[PDB]
């Protein structure tokens, strides 16, 4: 889809994709996140967070420590290229970012920073 992707996080701690392609032609890229199921944000909250593969662990650790009210993200974290809000079932949130913030030769990971979820809820994002 021309410069966007729609992604779901379910009540079983799964995103419905593990690989996102971003066409070099896109000026901006948008992620539209939703949450099928019935579980509340405090129990099964999902976000979509983007960093380099190298930065992922530091982002997830500091995010766990940040707490629910900060959407499990360290405020002003320089390693986070883009992120949605944390959402519960029935909710939706989108993020758009400048594709110029990605370069070739660099590995990107997307993931959710809700406590313990990133073991399951992660994937690659590839400039193509
Ligand atoms: Ag999650």
Curated annotation (Swiss-Prot):
Q: Which Gene3D superfamilies match?
A: Cupredoxins - blue copper proteins (2.60.40.420)
- Which parts form a coiled-coil structure per UniProt? none
Q: Name one GO molecular function term.
A: copper ion binding
InterPro entries the UniProt entry points to: Azurin, BlueCu_1, BlueCu_1_BS, Cu-binding_ET, Cupredoxin
Intrachain S-S bonds: 3-26
Checking PROSITE patterns in the record gives: COPPER_BLUE
Give the subcellular location: Periplasm
- Pfam families referenced in this protein's UniProt entry, alphabetically: Copper-bind
Q: Does the keyword Electron transport apply?
A: yes
**Primary location group:** periplasm
Record's keyword terms, sorted: Copper, Disulfide bond, Electron transport, Metal-binding, Periplasm, Signal, Transport
Residues reported in the UniProt entry to bind Cu cation: 46, 112, 117, 121
Gene Ontology CC, one term: plasma membrane
**Ranges for the Plastocyanin-like domain?**
1-128
The reply to whether Acetylation figures as a keyword in the UniProt entry is no
According to the lineage, what is the superkingdom? Answer: Bacteria
Q: What does this protein do?
A: Transfers electrons from cytochrome c551 to cytochrome oxidase.
In its UniProt entry, what is this protein called? Azurin
Give the classification, highest ranks. Answer: Bacteria, Pseudomonadati, Pseudomonadota, Gammaproteobacteria, Pseudomonadales
